[PDB]
């Protein structure tokens, strides 16, 4: 959701910073939020809109405490302008916590991952697929804290709704899986992981999350186990599918 007379400057800001053309986008930005303040004052969800499109330039160019600057600013913007239960709100808090996470500060990016969690459950539904996609987040952002009881849950309810709203074939049922195997393994639950493992490699195989790539989990978890031929079994079949 972005308004009509920001819809050509988001559009070419983007691209310029797609092109590593930074000294052109980073004026651009600050031009046309110099006018929009001039026209429509500081606290207009159109200003937060563009410190949002420059808080973007700058993660491009790794400048990572200007981008927190500038969501932040923009966060304010719009509880004041839109309020705190907004799919504004959650667009911005997300954007905050995918930085703070990307940096290694999971313990700080993991409340805007809940609060941007809770404003999706007011808007779409507690069962609805972004909601899903932010529980694969919030699931990674606790799996970097150990804190894998929640990681298994955010993940196992990720799945659920994954595959009774799109079915069991789709795309993310499929990464979704993967990323649960992923913290079964990392506890040592190697029974529910390697059964896990099994149903990727089946449905990847039917349809061509790779196969080469559950291939390979699998000859590591057999290892792993201590079961040494059920894994080079699966090794030297992770190679010839690599062929």
């Known amino acids: 959701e972005i308004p009509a007379r920001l819809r050509t400057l988001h559009n070419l800001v983007i691209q310029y910073a797609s092109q590593g053309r930074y000294e052109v986008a980073v004026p651009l930005c ?39 600057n500038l969501l932040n600013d923009a966060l304010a913007i719009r509880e004041k302008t839109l309020g705190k239960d907004h799919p504004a709100v959650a667009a911005t808090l997300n954007n905050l916590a995918v930085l703070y996470g990307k940096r290694g500060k999971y313990k700080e990016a993991e409340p805007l991952c809940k609060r941007a969690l ?24 606790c799996q970097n804290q150990g804190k894998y009881e929640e990681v298994e849950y955010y993940y196992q309810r990720a799945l659920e709704i994954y595959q009774t709203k799109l079915g069991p074939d789709d795309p993310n049922v ?70």
Request: net charge positive; glycine share 4%.
């Open 30 to 68: 600050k031009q046309a939020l110099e006018d929009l303040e001039k026209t429509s004052g500081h606290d207009h969800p159109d200003v937060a809109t563009m410190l949002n499109i420059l808080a973007l330039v700058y993660r491009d160019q790794n400048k990572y405490k200007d981008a927190a």
């Open 118 to 141: 809770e404003i999706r459950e007011k808007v779409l539904g507690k069962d609805h697929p972004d909601v899903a996609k932010q529980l694969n987040n919030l699931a990674l952002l």
């Open 174 to 243: 499929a990464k979704t899986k993967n990323n649960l195997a992923s913290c079964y393994l990392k506890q040592g639950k190697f029974k529910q992981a390697e059964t896990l493992y099994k149903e990727i490699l089946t449905r990847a195989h039917e349809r061509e999350p790779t196969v080469t790539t559950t291939l390979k989990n699998l000859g590591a978890l057999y290892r792993r186990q201590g079961k040494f031929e059920a894994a080079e079994t699966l090794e030297e079949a992770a190679m010839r599918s690599r062929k």
